[PDB]
Amino acid sequence: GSHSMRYFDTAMSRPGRGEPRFISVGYVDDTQFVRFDSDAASPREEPRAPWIEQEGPEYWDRNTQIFKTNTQTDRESLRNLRGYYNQSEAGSHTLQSMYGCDVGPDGRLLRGHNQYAYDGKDYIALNEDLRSWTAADTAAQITQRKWEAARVAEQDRAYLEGTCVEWLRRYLENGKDTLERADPPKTHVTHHPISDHEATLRCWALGFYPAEITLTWQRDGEDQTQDTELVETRPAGDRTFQKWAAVVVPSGEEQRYTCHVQHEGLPKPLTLRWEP
């Protein structure tokens, strides 16, 4: 499979500072394309990607309404969630959701997603069958009973299998120059002495898209997982990502180490070493 569409929603209450803020960001893989924020001076669904801009007036209004209505729905949910946990109306809380679909190279549904987390803990999720639910605790079971009764899963399923897959297919075609382009990482190894006894070899990966990558170090062909310091892949701000893996090595032994890079924008995986 090769692509995915996903909406990340965050609703957070703030007692005494107005109604809960709701923001929804939409993505195609690692490319954000829309945002909706109830805190914007004039909340509307707005482009964050060039290829979504061509969509007509009707597209923006329909989606602006969906997110305006989702704001009220999430606000009502947070109210209910406080009750399910016997929580005070003085505390601030967070309801997060992720929904979307994954499609294969032929654009066929690989799988749907619709899950929620309350205050950072998983709360409830639509199972892969797109028919049943998994609740985390007795509070989530209340949400499950209500959803089962209103036949909510059937509604999510039609969205995940129909509407979601179709918009993803449309988006992918409209932004084919970027969405369907993998940019390989530019790689190199640096070397920083630490003392007379050891030096750091840092393997770099820059300018790559999508974010997914694997950087590893091997000493004598052996993986150095326990000894490698790996940073979290970070956005450069130009749509690309960066990442590095470092290992402290004894002086004079640098040539026994090899950095291995795997990225989908590379035909065959790379093997690099420090070049004095």
């Binding site: 909406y7 989702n70 949910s77 209910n80 969630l81 959701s97 959803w147 969205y159 509407t163």
Partner: peptide, 8 residues
């Protein structure tokens, strides 16, 4: 396109 959400 967004999805219609249901109250928890």
């Amino acid at each position: 396109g967004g999805k219609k959400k249901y109250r928890l």
